[PDB]
Design an enzyme around this catalytic site. Structure first.
Site, PDB file in Angstrom:
ATOM      1  N   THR A  48     -29.099 -21.620  -6.901  1.00 42.57           N
ATOM      2  CA  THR A  48     -29.516 -22.391  -7.998  1.00 42.57           C
ATOM      3  C   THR A  48     -30.252 -23.523  -7.356  1.00 42.57           C
ATOM      4  O   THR A  48     -31.228 -23.918  -8.015  1.00 42.57           O
ATOM      5  CB  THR A  48     -28.414 -22.701  -8.906  1.00 42.57           C
ATOM      6  N   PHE A  55     -26.333 -16.364 -13.412  1.00 45.15           N
ATOM      7  CA  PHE A  55     -26.016 -15.608 -14.754  1.00 45.15           C
ATOM      8  C   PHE A  55     -24.960 -16.212 -15.541  1.00 45.15           C
ATOM      9  O   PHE A  55     -25.298 -15.928 -16.787  1.00 45.15           O
ATOM     10  CB  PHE A  55     -25.400 -14.170 -14.134  1.00 45.15           C
ATOM     11  N   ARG A  56     -23.897 -17.060 -15.199  1.00 45.27           N
ATOM     12  CA  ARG A  56     -22.683 -17.265 -16.105  1.00 45.27           C
ATOM     13  C   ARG A  56     -22.550 -18.732 -16.104  1.00 45.27           C
ATOM     14  O   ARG A  56     -21.634 -19.001 -16.820  1.00 45.27           O
ATOM     15  CB  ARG A  56     -21.547 -16.586 -15.713  1.00 45.27           C
ATOM     16  N   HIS A 124     -25.158  -5.611  -4.587  1.00 42.76           N
ATOM     17  CA  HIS A 124     -25.937  -5.263  -5.960  1.00 42.76           C
ATOM     18  C   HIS A 124     -27.379  -4.732  -5.486  1.00 42.76           C
ATOM     19  O   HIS A 124     -28.160  -4.678  -6.609  1.00 42.76           O
ATOM     20  CB  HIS A 124     -25.604  -6.143  -6.853  1.00 42.76           C
ATOM     21  N   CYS A 132     -35.870   5.189   1.363  1.00 45.41           N
ATOM     22  CA  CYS A 132     -36.221   6.359   1.376  1.00 45.41           C
ATOM     23  C   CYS A 132     -35.275   7.414   0.733  1.00 45.41           C
ATOM     24  O   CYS A 132     -34.084   7.368   1.333  1.00 45.41           O
ATOM     25  CB  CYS A 132     -36.815   7.082   2.634  1.00 45.41           C
ATOM     26  N   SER A 200     -18.221 -16.424  -9.718  1.00 46.46           N
ATOM     27  CA  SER A 200     -17.234 -16.407 -10.831  1.00 46.46           C
ATOM     28  C   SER A 200     -16.338 -15.155 -10.376  1.00 46.46           C
ATOM     29  O   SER A 200     -15.338 -15.538 -11.039  1.00 46.46           O
ATOM     30  CB  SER A 200     -17.813 -16.394 -12.182  1.00 46.46           C
TER      31      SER A 200
HETATM   32  N1  LIG Z   1     -24.964 -25.197  -6.754  1.00 47.75           N
HETATM   33  C1  LIG Z   1     -23.813 -24.794  -6.990  1.00 47.75           C
HETATM   34  N2  LIG Z   1     -22.624 -25.094  -6.388  1.00 47.75           N
HETATM   35  C2  LIG Z   1     -21.359 -24.286  -6.830  1.00 47.75           C
HETATM   36  N3  LIG Z   1     -21.278 -23.675  -7.668  1.00 47.75           N
HETATM   37  C3  LIG Z   1     -22.562 -23.211  -8.145  1.00 47.75           C
HETATM   38  C4  LIG Z   1     -23.654 -23.820  -8.077  1.00 47.75           C
HETATM   39  N4  LIG Z   1     -24.599 -23.288  -9.010  1.00 47.75           N
HETATM   40  C5  LIG Z   1     -23.861 -22.256  -9.916  1.00 47.75           C
HETATM   41  N5  LIG Z   1     -22.597 -22.285  -9.399  1.00 47.75           N
HETATM   42  C6  LIG Z   1     -21.634 -21.477  -9.845  1.00 47.75           C
HETATM   43  O1  LIG Z   1     -21.801 -20.209  -9.207  1.00 47.75           O
HETATM   44  C7  LIG Z   1     -21.287 -19.079 -10.003  1.00 47.75           C
HETATM   45  C8  LIG Z   1     -22.053 -17.901 -10.098  1.00 47.75           C
HETATM   46  O2  LIG Z   1     -21.540 -17.042 -11.057  1.00 47.75           O
HETATM   47  P1  LIG Z   1     -22.382 -15.871 -11.847  1.00 47.75           P
HETATM   48  O3  LIG Z   1     -23.461 -16.484 -12.736  1.00 47.75           O
HETATM   49  O4  LIG Z   1     -21.237 -14.944 -12.388  1.00 47.75           O
HETATM   50  O5  LIG Z   1     -22.934 -15.192 -10.638  1.00 47.75           O
HETATM   51  P2  LIG Z   1     -22.569 -13.957  -9.531  1.00 47.75           P
HETATM   52  O6  LIG Z   1     -22.968 -13.784  -8.213  1.00 47.75           O
HETATM   53  O7  LIG Z   1     -20.995 -14.061  -9.470  1.00 47.75           O
HETATM   54  O8  LIG Z   1     -22.653 -12.744 -10.410  1.00 47.75           O
HETATM   55  C9  LIG Z   1     -22.236 -11.283 -10.064  1.00 47.75           C
HETATM   56  C10 LIG Z   1     -23.274 -10.373 -10.665  1.00 47.75           C
HETATM   57  O9  LIG Z   1     -23.326 -10.609 -12.322  1.00 47.75           O
HETATM   58  C11 LIG Z   1     -24.497 -10.109 -12.533  1.00 47.75           C
HETATM   59  O10 LIG Z   1     -24.501  -9.313 -13.707  1.00 47.75           O
HETATM   60  C12 LIG Z   1     -25.206  -9.721 -11.206  1.00 47.75           C
HETATM   61  O11 LIG Z   1     -25.233  -8.357 -11.055  1.00 47.75           O
HETATM   62  C13 LIG Z   1     -24.576 -10.388 -10.230  1.00 47.75           C
HETATM   63  O12 LIG Z   1     -24.904 -10.094  -8.813  1.00 47.75           O
HETATM   64  C14 LIG Z   1     -20.856 -19.649 -11.330  1.00 47.75           C
HETATM   65  O13 LIG Z   1     -19.485 -19.705 -11.661  1.00 47.75           O
HETATM   66  C15 LIG Z   1     -21.286 -21.199 -11.397  1.00 47.75           C
HETATM   67  O14 LIG Z   1     -20.243 -22.098 -11.692  1.00 47.75           O
HETATM   68  O1  LIG Z   2     -28.127  -7.185 -10.407  1.00 48.92           O
HETATM   69  C1  LIG Z   2     -29.300  -7.680 -10.658  1.00 48.92           C
HETATM   70  C2  LIG Z   2     -30.453  -7.038 -10.840  1.00 48.92           C
HETATM   71  C3  LIG Z   2     -31.596  -7.462 -11.336  1.00 48.92           C
HETATM   72  C4  LIG Z   2     -31.885  -8.890 -11.306  1.00 48.92           C
HETATM   73  C5  LIG Z   2     -33.014  -9.478 -11.791  1.00 48.92           C
HETATM   74  C6  LIG Z   2     -33.206 -10.995 -11.697  1.00 48.92           C
HETATM   75  C7  LIG Z   2     -32.550 -12.111 -11.212  1.00 48.92           C
HETATM   76  C8  LIG Z   2     -32.217 -13.225 -12.036  1.00 48.92           C
HETATM   77  C9  LIG Z   2     -31.568 -14.275 -11.728  1.00 48.92           C
HETATM   78  O2  LIG Z   2     -31.096 -15.337 -12.380  1.00 48.92           O
HETATM   79  C10 LIG Z   2     -30.981 -14.284 -10.111  1.00 48.92           C
HETATM   80  C11 LIG Z   2     -31.145 -13.083  -9.296  1.00 48.92           C
HETATM   81  O3  LIG Z   2     -30.831 -13.292  -7.940  1.00 48.92           O
HETATM   82  C12 LIG Z   2     -32.170 -12.036  -9.828  1.00 48.92           C
HETATM   83  C13 LIG Z   2     -30.737  -9.730 -11.390  1.00 48.92           C
HETATM   84  C14 LIG Z   2     -29.283  -9.041 -11.152  1.00 48.92           C
HETATM   85 ZN   LIG Z   3     -37.828   8.956   4.990  1.00 47.11          ZN
END
Ligand SMILES: Nc1ncnc2c1ncn2[C@@H]1O[C@H](COP(=O)(O)OP(=O)(O)OC[C@H]2O[C@H](O)[C@H](O)[C@@H]2O)[C@@H](O)[C@H]1O
Ligand SMILES: Oc1ccc(/C=C\c2cc(O)cc(O)c2)cc1
Ligand SMILES: [Zn+2]
Ligand SMILES: [Cl-]
Ligand SMILES: [Cl-]
Ligand SMILES: [Cl-]
Ligand SMILES: [Cl-]
Length: 282
Positions: A48, A55-56, A124, A132, A200
């Protein structure tokens, strides 16, 4: 896809007062010093502070969608710099204090920070990585691979093959890459410390990996601004900016945060660098 469960979005942020925050990061430092196998789990919150929205979070992709608003990017993926957090994690692997890095992040920042790929699970996938279909040869590109969902990119395998190259970006229905999840799972189970940073922990089975460390007496630290699915199971929860937490922690460990010489790919972890002697604890 459209009805897809996006989980709990926009929960309130918690801030540990400075005194409580200083004490918990000292306690985190004690845990890293005491731990024989430390595994880090990262998610969108560690990116961030490079202008890539989560995302959340209050202004997360899914949170903003919920309220008819849009996420705001302060960078492209290509111009995004590794955070202090990313660069602290590079150093912790280099000095042998990080056994493995498990990440939900598709933003390509660990790979680009110069973090060794053989100690990283990208659960992910990676925006910059195509694979490939025939020989499974991966390519780490300097720009984002233009598709998502394991689709043909339009490029072909150059292994001495012409196999269809596809993105590594899982769609909702796609199961995790068996190599990365299996390595992530082994790391987490064998770990006696699992530290979560900016996730999260709402996604199965990514978010469940740190809980595997709790089996056989392992300790779980959760660093997050928001509550997390698994807060109950944490030995320690630290409510603050992951960069403040990691810079304070590096300072306690007597480690510098390394310079980023720009995008670099390292396939294999280098021989371990020297580190400070451990404090007397008990
Ligand atoms: N600077 C910061 N310092 C500490 N905490 C932070 C900061 N910025 C944000 N947060 C926290 O960072 C946390 C990030 O929560 P989420 O947004 O769920 O991200 P994920 O990586 O777990 O998402 C999982 C997958 O879901 C998607 O569909 C994709 O497929 C993802 O790959 C939050 O609780 C914030 O409070
Ligand atoms: O599973 C995923 C697949 C594709 C994407 C696309 C864009 C995206 C947006 C964000 O805010 C953070 C990030 O790292 C990527 C996001 C998640
Ligand atoms: Zn190949
Ligand atoms: Cl988006
Ligand atoms: Cl090194
Ligand atoms: Cl997608
Ligand atoms: Cl020290």
């Amino acid at each position: 896809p459209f009805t897809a469960d996006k989980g709990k979005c926009g929960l309130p942020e918690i801030f540990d007062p400075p005194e409580e925050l200083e004490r918990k990061v000292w306690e985190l430092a004690r845990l890293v010093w005491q731990s024989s196998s430390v595994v880090f789990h990262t998610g969108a919150g560690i990116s961030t502070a490079s202008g890539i929205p989560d995302f959340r979070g209050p202004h997360g992709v899914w949170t903003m969608e919920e309220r008819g608003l849009a996420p705001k990017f302060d960078t492209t993926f290509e111009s995004a710099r590794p955070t202090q957090t990313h660069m602290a994690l590079v150093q912790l692997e280099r000095v042998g204090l990080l056994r493995f890095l498990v990440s939900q992040n598709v933003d390509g920042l660990h790979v680009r920070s110069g973090f060794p790929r053989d100690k990283l699970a990208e659960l992910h996938g990676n925006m910059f990585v195509e694979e490939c279909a025939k020989c499974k040869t991966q390519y780490v590109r300097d720009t984002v691979v233009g598709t998502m969902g394991l689709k043909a990119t339009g490029r072909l395998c150059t292994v001495a093959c012409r196999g269809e190259l596809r993105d590594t970006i899982l769609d909702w229905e796609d199961s995790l890459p068996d190599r990365d999840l299996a390595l992530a799972d082994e790391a987490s189970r064998n770990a006696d410390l699992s530290i979560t940073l900016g996730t999260s922990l709402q996604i199965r089975p990514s978010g469940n990996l740190p809980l595997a460390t709790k089996r056989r007496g392992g300790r779980l630290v959760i660093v997050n601004l928001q509550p997390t699915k698994h807060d109950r199971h944490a030995d320690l929860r630290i409510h603050g900016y992951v960069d403040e937490v990691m810079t304070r922690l590096m300072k306690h460990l007597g480690l510098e945060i390394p310079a980023w010489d720009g995008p670099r790919v390292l396939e294999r972890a280098l021989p371990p660098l020297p580190r400070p002697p451990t404090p007397k604890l008990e």
